């Protein structure tokens, strides 16, 4: 075992929070049904939304902030690649993955703020 990562945990809880402030609409809030679409993963490889990231981040699956950002990145990618720009979806993940940036950008650097060495602070 070790010390114990317990503050990364909570970073990233308050973080994914911020990036749902962005998405008023909850377009990706939940998961997309598949009964609509039966070619959904057909075209997404790796389907990752707000709600499954969650599920994986309280489940202590993402222990480096590059892993909680991998799955935001594909939320908008999936659906940037599987809808168009016409597409409603679309102009949505498009405006989380601008903004969102910056609270991804925010919370980045406490995460490496944490160990005093590799960062200042």
Same mark, same amino acid.
């Given at each position: 075992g070790s010390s114990g990562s317990s503050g990364f945990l909570i970073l990233l809880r308050k973080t994914l929070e911020q990036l749902q402030?962005? *998405?008023?609409?909850?377009?990706?809030?939940e998961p997309v049904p598949l009964?609509?679409?039966? *070619?959904y993963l057909d075209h997404i490889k790796k389907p990752m939304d707000f709600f499954t990231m969650k599920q994986n981040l309280e489940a202590y699956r993402y222990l480096n902030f590059d892993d909680f950002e991998e799955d935001f990145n594909l939320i908008v990618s999936n659906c940037l690649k599987y809808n168009a720009?016409?597409?409603i979806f679309y102009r949505a993940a498009v405006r989380l993955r601008e903004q969102g940036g910056a609270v991804l950008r925010q919370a980045r650097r406490q995460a490496e703020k944490m160990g005093s060495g590799p960062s200042s602070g």
């Amino acid at each position: 075992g070790s010390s114990g990562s317990s503050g990364f945990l909570i970073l990233l809880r308050k973080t994914l929070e911020q990036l749902q402030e962005k *998405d008023t609409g909850n377009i990706f809030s939940e998961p997309v049904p598949l009964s609509e679409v039966p *070619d959904y993963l057909d075209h997404i490889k790796k389907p990752m939304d707000f709600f499954t990231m969650k599920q994986n981040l309280e489940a202590y699956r993402y222990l480096n902030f590059d892993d909680f950002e991998e799955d935001f990145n594909l939320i908008v990618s999936n659906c940037l690649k599987y809808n168009a720009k016409d597409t409603i979806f679309y102009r949505a993940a498009v405006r989380l993955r601008e903004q969102g940036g910056a609270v991804l950008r925010q919370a980045r650097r406490q995460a490496e703020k944490m160990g005093s060495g590799p960062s200042s602070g």
